[PDB]
Structure formats: structure tokens, C-alpha cells
Design a protein around this nucleic acid. Sequence first.
DNA 1: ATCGGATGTATATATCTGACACGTGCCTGGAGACTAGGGAGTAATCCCCTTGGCGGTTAAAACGCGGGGGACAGCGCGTACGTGCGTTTAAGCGGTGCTAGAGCTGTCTACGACCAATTGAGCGGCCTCGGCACCGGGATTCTCGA
DNA 2: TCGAGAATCCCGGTGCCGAGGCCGCTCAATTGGTCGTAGACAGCTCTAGCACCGCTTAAACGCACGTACGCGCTGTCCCCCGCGTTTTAACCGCCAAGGGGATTACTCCCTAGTCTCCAGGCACGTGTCAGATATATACATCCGAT
Lengths: 78, 82, 104, 105, 69, 69, 93, 94, 96, 96
Amino acid sequence: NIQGITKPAIRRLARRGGVKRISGLIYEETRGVLKVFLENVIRDAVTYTEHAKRKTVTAMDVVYALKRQGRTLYGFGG
Amino acid sequence: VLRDNIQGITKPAIRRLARRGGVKRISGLIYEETRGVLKVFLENVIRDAVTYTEHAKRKTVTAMDVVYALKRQGRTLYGFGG
Amino acid sequence: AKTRSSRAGLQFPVGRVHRLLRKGNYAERVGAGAPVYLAAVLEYLTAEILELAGNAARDNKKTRIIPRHLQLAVRNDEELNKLLGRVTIAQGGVLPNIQSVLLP
Amino acid sequence: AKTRSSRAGLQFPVGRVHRLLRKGNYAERVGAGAPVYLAAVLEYLTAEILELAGNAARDNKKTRIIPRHLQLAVRNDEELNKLLGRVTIAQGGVLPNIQSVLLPK
Amino acid sequence: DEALVEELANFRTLVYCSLCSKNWKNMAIKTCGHVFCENCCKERLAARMRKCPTCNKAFSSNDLLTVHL
Amino acid sequence: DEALVEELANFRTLVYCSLCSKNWKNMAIKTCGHVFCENCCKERLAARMRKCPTCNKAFSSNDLLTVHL
Amino acid sequence: TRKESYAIYVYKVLKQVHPDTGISSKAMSIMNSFVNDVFERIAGEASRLAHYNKRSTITSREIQTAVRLLLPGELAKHAVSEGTKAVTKYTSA
Amino acid sequence: TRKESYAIYVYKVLKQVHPDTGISSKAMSIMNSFVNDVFERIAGEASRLAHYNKRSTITSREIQTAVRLLLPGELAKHAVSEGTKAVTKYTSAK
Amino acid sequence: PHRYRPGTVALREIRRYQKSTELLIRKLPFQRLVREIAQDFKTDLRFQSSAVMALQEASEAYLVALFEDTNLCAIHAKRVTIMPKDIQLARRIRGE
Amino acid sequence: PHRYRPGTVALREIRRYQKSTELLIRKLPFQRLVREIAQDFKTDLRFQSSAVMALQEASEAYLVALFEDTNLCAIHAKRVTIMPKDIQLARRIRGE
DNA sequence: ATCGGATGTATATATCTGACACGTGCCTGGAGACTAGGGAGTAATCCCCTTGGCGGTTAAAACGCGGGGGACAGCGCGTACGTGCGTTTAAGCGGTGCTAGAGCTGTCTACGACCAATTGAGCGGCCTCGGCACCGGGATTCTCGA
DNA sequence: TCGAGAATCCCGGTGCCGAGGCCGCTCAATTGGTCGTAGACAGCTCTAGCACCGCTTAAACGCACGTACGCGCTGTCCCCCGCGTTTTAACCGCCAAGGGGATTACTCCCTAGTCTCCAGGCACGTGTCAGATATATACATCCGAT
Ligand SMILES: [Zn+2]
Ligand SMILES: [Zn+2]
Ligand SMILES: [Zn+2]
Ligand SMILES: [Zn+2]
């Protein structure tokens, strides 16, 4: 579940971002932020994959769902 | 031609907008900074209205070109015939 | 000779919507049951906002609807505010609020 | 029999663009010289980025462009960075930058 | 004399940027080694012209090195 | 008129190597932007004179760049 | 010449919810623009959504799912039901 | 079945600027998806201009004024200058 | 000599101006500015009254919405006065 | 023995991760998280590998772009440690 | 904390006009009825790809301890900004005049849709070797307690 | 100030699998006519955008004065970074089963297209009353002396 996003994994993203010191309460805040974004993308992906009477959500549905939210993504076709 | 009309935006006029915004105390060096932000927002909008108004072979800006220009930047405006 | 909108039971025009949808370069063909479905959704949203506007006008002892009531009703409701996110209403105004720390 | 692209002195295909414009429900009719104008623009933009990426592909002592080299081409120039302002290139990375307050004295 | 002026004119062409003929040569390109002034070079970089006026070799912004005297 | 004689000498010392005064400034240093002649450069590397004369700093093998004119 | 609008229909709807109020001409234009924007961006999603599936007709099913991708949360659950309840009546008669 | 892409034309363009330089599959797949994104934007903007003025044909003018509306600043000048030079060559050809 | 504490009058103007809906800039000075700006793209141009009014109706909203977010960055730094370094940060975080 | 001053390792690892290019979160737990989140919309679903890869790439990009905006408003308060209030202020200003 | 004086904010009654609501003429766009053909619904099938399970390495995660730098609170000072008053400037409103440009109408010609016949360009399948990945050794640079 | 120690870079050798070229083969772009409607052009009407002047008078402007707040400094203490040891499960390689995604025939009925007819929505005209404006009055609020 949501406990698979471990503290070193969270801190590596912060290091790439460019921070130098991290307070101890950050991880709990960021997990609940990521969980909200994933739901928003997946709901549209599932609606797209359900309109076409399919049973497997494909990569193009994810690409379209990302595209209509103001976030396009190159490198997966289309 | 007409020049240096940027000083028509007076200090009380700028402060009245900040009052509606909600601030309470205003620093001294805010008016010059703010006058440079409104002069940039009015170039992007007008450069598109002028582009619209010359593709139609007209030589007068209408009230629909401004609405289209504002819509093209994700700033749709209701009330003027949009 | 009955109108196409009275059969469905709506107040909005079905034929006008059909010809507007069949002439805006959307698709090569338009199904028969599409305008009936689309003209029933356009009627619900306008009533939804026009009831809140009426209540806001009534709370101010007036008997008309000036643009301020529209802005108040839109900004006071979460779903409507989210739907009408990046849109501005002329002569609208602003929702009254003051930061808590600023008060004495 | 020559091709329209060769007659117009281009590299991109004009007939395919002409067909794509027609079969897309954009307008009822399509002018004659519209594809020959639209295909000359799609090629200049491609040649710009493929020229800006070859310098990055060389400063790292490589001879084959990879997505990381395309990432550094559209982020070091205002003109292209403002056009691709909301695009996430896969396997791109970030741009090296450290705030000046963090460094030691 | 003319020879004294000619050497003055000959050396004048070496100190000033050929494009501008108004400022001392200040900016040099690593790829080709040619030296021009800093002012004339920058406006070219904003005109999307990355080819050397002399040796035609392509260059980029990072290949710009300042020179002294 | 000595008025333009001084300019030529000022022009001459600018382009001539300040060390030998016999060669053009055709070998510049990448580290600090100074320019000298190739004649006065490699003689210093014989004794490992990595310290530049003008600003007095060290250098390397890739800090010397060929320049023209 | 003439020009079309939704004025009469909006007034007819208004006299149903509040039978004793009115509306000003300046707010009428706002109400007329809102219904043109919503209809424009609902029917613009169906044409693109039918192109993905290599279809040629936009039917009621392409709109039932185009409404679900725009209206947030509670609004969609009511709009879909009211749209569906209207087609059944029309088909029967 | 068949599938179409600009992978053959991008490679031809690349060998005119950098004579000896390859390109990997991921880079090709990105450069392929960028052209479609630009093409879908230009034509999509040009259609609304035709609709606004009660016209029915997309001629060369709408493309020119749609390029001048999307590309920022100095790119538009070069794009227009490169398009209007290809069109005149095409029209006066064989 | 009946004066007021420094801020009780400015705290009332907020209530006054958050309840009324009207333009806050002078019409002629604002209209001259548009004509001055729009004479570089193309000379000898003409405007409708509605075009100028619609151009003015949007700048008010833009400036008001910008002054609301720069008041949060000043609160974040334990202040009540807004300095020019807040307008830069608020404008940079939303990308412009 | 031998130790390092607090901060040097942080700077070197910053320099390290801003030069590489692979994914930072482990793959199998993320796949499990996606499969669990998707269960509340429609049961008995199937996923392609490319869909999960695209989801991971988008999530990484979003989180990386947000951690570099919270840092910029952490410095504004003359501070060098990021905080949940900084994250909340950044999200509020961005316009969520 | 407890009164008091002054100031700005609600509260109640004329009056008066310009915009809202309603009525009528008329014309064009929407409703009926019938026809033909192509898009879409349905059945069969086959083969790729997704799910599930098993065993070994080992790389990454978890936990604990020391201590030193950074977050935070309290103080003091002095410059910048809020508040009020008198004087000056230009905006707002009204009225008149003139003409440049928007909007509509009638011609007609050149340009783009449409169809039959050709052929060469671009796509699918296969080979191959060289650029890049990886590992083992020195050489140079960076940090910290003296 | 600079030596000990650890991290990082330049170089050489080995190997492998994906980019780059080649070939055969459909089917889509090219020629060549034909026709009918969209649009370019000339002319006319009339309206609304621009320019100018005179008269209030509201608001922008400059100045004096006081004080609340921004900023710099100092001190205590607690919590996050660095480093070592131990426990976990991620990752790689391998195997097998069957589901459903994609493809191909076949039919049938639903939407485009045309002609006819008439009522509904639009332009224009008119009454009248809801709210803006002014004025006298009641009261909540705030800063000071105590
Ligand atoms: Zn020069
Ligand atoms: Zn050169
Ligand atoms: Zn020398
Ligand atoms: Zn030096």
C-alpha cells in the first residue's frame, strides 16, 4: 500500500529537487499529496478504458488522461 | 504622438486596488514595481487583438477581438458578448 | 404537428441544438438521440445557478438579479466555483474576507 | 513525374500533410498552397532542435543522440523553453542548479 | 606621411570589430579562434545565426571566451 | 605630429607581445583571458611556469588556445 | 438581419424556480455567454473522443461519457441521470 | 498492418545539419511525437480563424496568421520568412 | 486634534472597497495609455468604446487577484507590510 | 576516527542525483500501489507495462517539480529547512 | 477594567425617471413524408501477452547513538509610513460638427471537389559489426583537524 | 597554515546487441479532365468614432508630525545529520496456462437528402413602477481620562 513509498525514496526526490535540510514531518505530508494526484489521473484513465468496452487499461489511455489535465508527456507514442 | 502616459496610474489609484485586495500596510517601493507589471500584461493582450483585427482587413479594434485574445490565454471573460 | 422539445419535455430548443451541432464541424454524422440528451444537460446547470442567484438576490431585499448576485452564488459554492475556475464576471466584485492575523 | 515536395524544394512530405488536413474535419475545403506552407514550418522547427541537440551530444563525447541531450536543448534557450513550457520529456532529468545561499563560505 | 598613416590604418583594422568598427575586439570563439567585440556578437546570438562570419563553422554560446588587449 | 605617433605605438604595444615585442598576440590563455605570442608560451612550460605573468595564476595543457588576428 | 440567443428559454426557466423575480439586461448577457461556453466545451470533447475509436457518428453514449470527464463530482451524478431520463420519454413517444 | 511516422524524414533532415551523428530509438520516438503535437495545434488554431469570419476554406493566410499567434517572439519571423519563400518557389515552378 | 490610531482607518477601507463593485482607475488616463501602447504594432488605429471598457475590466481583476497572493507571502515571513520581493516570488511561483 | 561536517555529504549527493537520469522510486511497490488505488473504480482490471511506466514517470516529474518550489519559499523566510507550511503555501499559490 | 464624547454607519419617508415587461406583424427556419446506401452490430478464431509461482544474490532498508548547528524567543533602536489639512489640477458632463469606414447588395469568373488509370515510394523482414557498457589501475583533487 | 585520508577522474582492454543498410512488394500519390459554387470586386448608405469648447468641483498633491514595526543582536536546547550493524524483500532468470485483442465475413436499419407547408421566434412600439437620490434620525464604535 502507501507504505511502500519509503523515507529514503522520498528523500532522494528532495535531493534531486535541491534541498539540503528536511524536517521530520515532510514524508507524511508528501504521501497524502501523491495519493491525491494518482487518483485524479487514474479515474480519467479508467473512464477512457471503459468507454471502449475494454478490460485492460492501456498506455494510450494514460497518455490522453494526462494530456487533458494540462500535462502532456512525450516518449510513449501519439 | 502621446508619451509617458504611464504616470496616469496614480498612487491613490494603485492603493485603492490593494485595499480591495486585502492588504493593510504598503511599502514605499511598491508603486514603481506595480507600474511595470501592468505595462507587460497590456502588451500580450493587445498584440493578439491587433493580429485579429488585421487578418479581417479592418482598421478598427472591435469588442470581440479583445474577448478572443483574452480567451486564447485562459482568461475567458463573460459579459461583453462572448 | 408537435415540437421535438415538447415530446422530450424540456424548455430548451432541440432543433436549434441539432442544427448547431450538425454544422459546427464536429463529426461527419450526428445521431438522432444526441440533441435530446445534450439539451437536457444545458437546462439543468442554468436552473442550478439561477436558483442560487435568486436566493442571493432575495437575501438583499431586492427583486431583480444584478451581476453581483451571480458572482456571489458562483463563488459561494464549491462545485460551481471549480467548474467556473478561470473565468471572470464583469462588474462582479470580490468575496468579503479579511486575514485573521491582521485584526487587533 | 516529380513529387510536390521536390517541386517545392522541401524535405517533408506535402501529399501526406494535404491528406491529413482533409481527413481531420478542420474545414469543408482546403486551399492549394496551404500544405506547402505548413510543411515548410514543421521542418524548420525540427532542424532547429536537431541542431541544438547535436552540440550537447558532442560536449559529452558521444556520437548518438539520447533523450538526455534533447532535455538540455529545450531548457537552455528561452524561445524553445517558452514553447515547450508544459511538456515532460521521458528519461530527461533536470538542469543542474544550486541556490547560492546553500553553498559554504 | 601616407606610409605612417597606412600602418595606422592597417593596425586600426586589427583592433576594432570588423562588423562594428567602433569597439575593441573583445569576444573570441573557441571553435575557430576568431576575435570580435562582445556587443556585435550577442545580437547575432539573438538573431538565431550560429555560423561564424569568417570561417562559417557552427558555434554556441558556451564557446564564447573574453580576451584582454 | 606626435599626436598620432603615440597612437601607433599604443597600437603597436597592444598587438605585439609585451614580453618579446617581436611577435603578434596569437596564443591566448583560456584561464584568465590574456593573450601573448606562441614564442613566449612554450619556453615557460620548459621550467613548468604554470603561473601567468599578468595576474599570476597556474594553468595546464588545455588552457592554451590558438587565436588569429 | 437578425441574431439568435437563449433569452426566451432562460426567462422561461427562471419563471419556474422563482415565479416572482426578474433579471436585468446586463446579467442576461452573462447568462447567455455561460450557456454558449458550456455547450461549446462539452461538444468539443465528444468529437475528439469519437476520433480515438475510429468512429464517425457522435451518439448519446459519446455525450454521456463526455459529461463525466468535465463536470466535477456531485454535479455529474445528477446531470447524467436527468439526461438519461429525458431520452426515454422521447423514444417512447 | 501498416503504421506511418516521420522517422524517415527526421533522419533525412538530421544528415543535413550534422553529417555524422546517429539517433537512438527513444529520441526518434520523442521527435516523432513532437511534430504531431505542433501540427495538431497549428491547424486547430487555423480552423477557428476560418470559422470566425464566416468562411469555409483554409487557405495560406490562416496558416500564416496562426503561426504568428503560437510561436513566441523571434521564432515567428523566421518561420514566416521560410514559409513564404517555399510558397513562391512552388507556385512559379514547372 | 482628534486623531486615530495608525491603522484603524486603513482597516475600514478594506470593508468599504470589498462591498462595492465599480472601476477604480480613471477612465481618460487609462484610455490614453492603451492608445499609446497600441501605436507601435500598427499606426493610425481606431478603437470602440466597448473594446476599451473590456480591456479595463480585465486589468482590474488581474491586479486584484495578484495583490491577494502577495499578501500571503508577507504573512509567511512574519510581516504585515508587503515589499517588492513578494511580488517577484508570487509571480515566479505560478510561472510568469 | 574520521567524520564529515553536516552538509558536505548532502551537497555531494545533490550534485550526484542532478546528473543521473533513472527512476528513484522502487518499481514493484509502486505497481502494487497503483493496482490497489484502481480497485475502487472498477474491479477486475488489467494493466500494460507501459501504462505503469508512464504513471511512474509523471509522478516523479510532478514531485520533483514541487520539491523545488517549496524550497524557494522556504528560503524567503530566512530559513534553510523545508516545512509542511511551506508545501501548503506553494500548493495554494500554484492554484490547486 | 469603567464612563464619555465624538464620529461614522444603519434606518425611515418623499419623487421621479428610465428600463423592464408585454403586445403585434410577418417571414424564414423547423416539422412531415419518402428513398437509398453505407456504417455499424454480431459471430468466429487465433495467437500474443498478462498473470501466477519458484529459487538465489545481495543491495537497499531498518535501527541505534553521539553531538553540533540551526530554529526560536526576547530586547532595543531608529527610520519609514499613516493621518490630517490647505491648495491646485485636471476629470466628468453637456453640446455641436463633420467624414472615414463598416455593412449590405449584385456579377461572374477562376479554383477546388470528384473520378478513372499508373507507377514508384515507403514499409515489413534480415543481417552485421562497431559504439557504448563495464571492470581494473593509477593520478589528481577536496576536506578537516593540526 | 598543510599532511592524511577519502572520493573522483583519465586510460586501457574486452564484449555484445541495436542502429544502419538492403530487398521485395503493395497501394497511395500523380495526371488528366469536368463542373459548379465560394469569393473577389465595385457601388451605395448611414452611423459612430473623433475633435473642440465651457463649466463645476472631486480628487490628486505637497507638507508636518508622531509612533508602531522592521531589523539586527544574543542566548539556550533539541533534533536532524553521519556512521555502523543487522534484517528484508527486490530483482533476475525460468516456466506454464488461458484470456481477450485484433482480424475477418455478413447483414440490416438508421441517418443524410429532397420537397412541401406553416407557426414560432424576432424586430418594433408603449405603459408604469423599482430603485436611485436626498434628508432627518437612531445607534454601534472607538480613543481618552480615570
Ligand atoms: Zn563589433
Ligand atoms: Zn570562425
Ligand atoms: Zn613574445
Ligand atoms: Zn592572468
